[PDB]
């Protein structure tokens, strides 16, 4: 099997679209983004201690309106939240430094999903063979290596 | 002096330093440990973002204190 990237639009919502795509089994749909944004603000608003001005960068209500916009980018804050929500390990591989950031590594979940990051845009990763495979065992460490190879091949291209 | 840093991923990073290092130099030691680029790091302690060009212990950071790393990773 080979690890491949699936291209999602760069319409400011790529993170949300990429996440949705891998938790949902290889479903591409950029319409999930408003409700995914609405969930996020919902979670962030419900705990202004944990999501304070320091952690966020803005004030807790200010951030909730911000992320509800259709032109604002998701970042590690949204990943961490989604990780807890979907009860999943979201692994983000960087094309720029060829490294993996495992969101939810400390919780011990039973599955992990892979995203690829190039500094401004997110795309999702999947296995091909038969429908693509997007969710993997959190004990499958071959996908980690498979992604790195993928990310580095990208890195070469740039 | 030994500190702990809790990352967004959940990992608790223990950093070996002195109370007179720059925050941009903490990000340098963090990069020597996790491969995270300092231009993606945001250090925070006690509900306050730490500014580059400043030393620890300027904000009461003692040994065995817990600071916070928030990755940016914005992408759309």
Residue numbers in the entry:
A (entry chain A): 147 to 275, 280 to 308
B (entry chain B): 1 to 76
Task: Tell me what the authors wrote about this structure, in their words.
In a structure of inactive OTUD2 C160A in complex with Lys11-linked diUb, the diUb molecule did not bind across the active site but occupied S1 and a previously unidentified S2 site on OTUD2. The S2 site is formed by two exposed hydrophobic residues (Ile292 and Val295) on the C-terminal OTUD2 α helix that bind the hydrophobic Ile44 patch of Ub. The orientation of Ub bound to the S2 site most likely allows preferential binding of Lys11-polyUb, given that the S2 Ub points with its C terminus toward Lys11 of the S1 Ub. The S2 site in OTUD2 is conserved in higher eukaryotes but not in yOtu1 and dmOtu1. We tested whether the S2 site was functionally relevant in isolated catalytic domains of OTUD2 variants and mutated Ile292 and Val295 to Gln (referred to as OTUD2 MutS2), which did not affect reactivity or diUb specificity. All proteins hydrolyzed Lys11-diUb similarly, but Lys11-linked tri- and tetra-Ub were more rapidly cleaved to di- and mono-Ub by WT OTUD2, whereas OTUD2 MutS2 or dmOtu1 did not show enhanced activity for longer Lys11-linked chains. The accumulation of Lys11-linked diUb indicated that this product might be stabilized by binding the S1 and S2 sites on OTUD2, as was observed in the complex structures, although OTUD2 MutS2 did not show enhanced diUb cleavage. The S2 site specifically enhanced the cleavage of Lys11-linked polyUb, given that Lys6-, Lys48-, or Lys63-linked triUb were less well hydrolyzed by WT OTUD2 in comparison to MutS2 or were not hydrolyzed at all. Hence the presence of an S2 site on the OTUD2 catalytic domain allows it to specifically target longer Lys11-linked chains, revealing an additional mechanism of OTU specificity. Our structural studies of Ub and diUb complexes for OTUD2 unexpectedly revealed another mechanism that targets OTUD2 to longer Ub chains.
